[PDB]
Write a protein that binds this DNA or RNA. Structure first.
Lengths: 108, 180
RNA sequence: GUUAGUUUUACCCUACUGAUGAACUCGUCGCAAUGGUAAUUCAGCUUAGUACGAGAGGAACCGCUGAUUCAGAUAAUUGGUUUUUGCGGUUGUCCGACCGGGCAGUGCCGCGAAGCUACCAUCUGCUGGAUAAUGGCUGAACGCCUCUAAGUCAGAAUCCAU
RNA sequence: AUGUGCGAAAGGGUCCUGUAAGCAGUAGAGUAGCCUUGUUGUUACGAUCUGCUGAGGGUAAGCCCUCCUUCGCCUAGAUUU
RNA sequence: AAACUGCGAAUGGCUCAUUAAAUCAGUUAUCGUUUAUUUGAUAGUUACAUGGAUAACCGUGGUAAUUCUAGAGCU
RNA sequence: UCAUAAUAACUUCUCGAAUCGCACGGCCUUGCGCCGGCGAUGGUUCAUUCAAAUUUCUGCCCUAUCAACUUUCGACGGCUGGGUAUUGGCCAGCCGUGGUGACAACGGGUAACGGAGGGUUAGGGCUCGACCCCGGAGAAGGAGCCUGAGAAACGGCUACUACA
């Protein structure tokens, strides 16, 4: 047992109810009552029928919004050691006292 | 249904097999790039939050970000798109890709760790891998070591060692030929 | 040989289908004399490429599952019906305009619950006794033989009952 | 014939239709005036659109519930064995 | 080697289906237009050197299937 | 109304070198200072070359049992614009009523790509030309488009029809 949804209006369908329609181009449509299929075979647009589920979501009735953009931008973490130099090598070299650097310029 | 877990911080990756569906129930109906809690996976996953990055369909098609559907759709992929590699200038080919809404149909998920938990993972967060290459441009070398305007950027470049096959000679050193 | 040409009456008696009812106080729960009587046929699987035959060809009993014609009920679902004049759309004219209404014997159109209803929809349709044809048992008349002469066994969509 | 009574209203549930009247809008193809000539300058007309609005209307006449919503009625009159 | 970037792939080769002022031939015009490349000239308005990505690569995967491709880490 | 020059302004607005290789030189205030040669690759405008697209004049077989044709929804011309690398009824509005024909229009046939040329000869002619050179068109039938100086390309892409 399972339930289906009306193609035209979105109402819930329980076993034994509604109909099943197969068109010439091998497309399958399901209906829940006589109101849906009578409107479908009349070439009506479901987006202009006020009580359909598809119409309601287009006009955003009963639904709210959420924003989480700037929260993700904060994702930053630490660093690791390159194959050439282990982690102890990099920070020792960056933290060399300026006196050694002054000696390097004069020596060179 | 397999899981592809990656750790960007430690540079480690792992693949796990999950066969029990109620643990994967909380993953359904989520979107690619969303935030999820890893608690239902197991006791060892407490305190973990994961990011959904991508997946593959049962037939093998991948998910494409920006298309909202649980099924798969045909698209006219031009140059610069994700899952297309053109063979000729200006070529456009029609292909089929699977939507960005997670569902039971997919075969593999890909996800990464955002925040570490109290417990450790036996084969994922207990090991680290080193980087491959150091910086090569002149200005990037100076910023990396926080050198001043005139600090002889030549001397501070990273150089590794390599040895010949069986010559018995000493190994030598390799350097990246600073540019700019 | 060919073409066109008025088809009257039932309220009476009986018969038939149903419906009330006087007398012995008013009621509730029961027995069953007599009258009526109902089911029908096919196909598929298996038995089996078996029995039979040189070959070509080619069956049947049980078992299982469906279908045709008929009969009695029912409306959860699907279809039909619309005076629910229930809600909506629209033409003409009338109430000064808006709102709300009249008329066009139900102005017209879309959907339409309730009720009724269709092998156009769903459910259900029993087994005892006695026998005819025929095949038999013991056994004379006729020292043999024989289903019959006395007695007796099986037995049909038949007959009588449930 | 004092009762889980009967009747008339009301509230809730369930259904059918498909978004009421009224007010407001930097919505609206455009048109006609007046000025200090505007970044919406204002005054007038305008099928339609948007908000309050899955709203409004109908619902037993052979639909359901209510001792815990309200107001009424009642141990007869006549004939016969 | 690989890979990014630049250029070529619009030349050659084949055929005669359509086509009756159409194609085509000889002869004019572009004061009515575009032009890679080649050739010759030609442009006075932090600076001792600016900023972020990506391929190759390592490593982890999906589909029976293709010169299909995913997510993670360097330059 | 050409070349060129001057003035008032304008622009999601350009270009005017943050590139590479050989040589090892010359000055004095001797500072890890200044100057200096030849090439590679780019770059704005004009000229040239290979071109390309349109365009003037004249010239094609048989047929009247094909004699009138063109303008529904441009057929001939005027004007203001739109679009194109540019001219143009190429296209959009408004306004005129025109254009071809017995000196063969229009239509039907072609076992028809055009030409340089082949075969046969007193002279005049008759007939053939798919095919090595020049021009045009096509990649099974139709349409649409990207990149690029150049394509309506098919040993490039998208869709339908027919095969597979």
């Amino acid at each position: 047992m399972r339930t289906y949804e009306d193609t035209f209006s979105g109402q819930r369908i329980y076993p034994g109810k509604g109909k099943l329609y197969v068109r010439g181009d091998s497309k399958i449509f399901r209906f829940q009552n006589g109101k849906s299929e009578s409107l479908f075979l009349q070439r009506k647009n479901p987006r202009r029928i006020a009580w359909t589920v598809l119409y309601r979501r287009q006009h955003r009735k009963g639904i709210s919004e959420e924003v989480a953009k700037k929260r993700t931008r904060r994702t930053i973490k630490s660093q690791r050691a390159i194959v050439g130099a282990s982690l102890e090598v990099i920070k020792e070299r960056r933290s060399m006292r300026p006196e050694a650097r002054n000696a390097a310029r004069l020596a060179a | 249904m397999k899981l592809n877990i990656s750790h960007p911080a430690n540079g480690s990756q792992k693949l796990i097999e999950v066969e029990d569906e109620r643990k994967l129930r909380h993953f359904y109906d989520k979107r690619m790039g969303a935030e999820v809690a890893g608690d239902p996976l197991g006791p060892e996953w407490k305190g973990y939050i994961l990011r959904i990055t991508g997946g593959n369909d049962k037939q093998g098609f991948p998910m494409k970000q920006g298309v909202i559907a649980p099924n798969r759709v045909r698209l006219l992929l031009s140059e610069g798109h994700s899952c297309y590699r053109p063979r000729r200038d200006g070529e456009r080919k029609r292909k089929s890709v699977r939507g960005c809404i997670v569902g039971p149909d997919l075969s593999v998920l890909a996800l990464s760790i955002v925040k570490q938990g109290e417990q450790d993972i036996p084969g994922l967060t207990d090991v680290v891998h080193p980087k491959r290459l150091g910086p090569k441009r002149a200005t990037k070398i100076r910023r990396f070591f926080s050198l001043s305007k005139d600090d002889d950027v030549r001397k501070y470049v990273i150089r590794r060692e390599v040895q010949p096959k069986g010559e018995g000679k000493k190994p030598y050193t390799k350097a990246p030929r600073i540019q700019r």
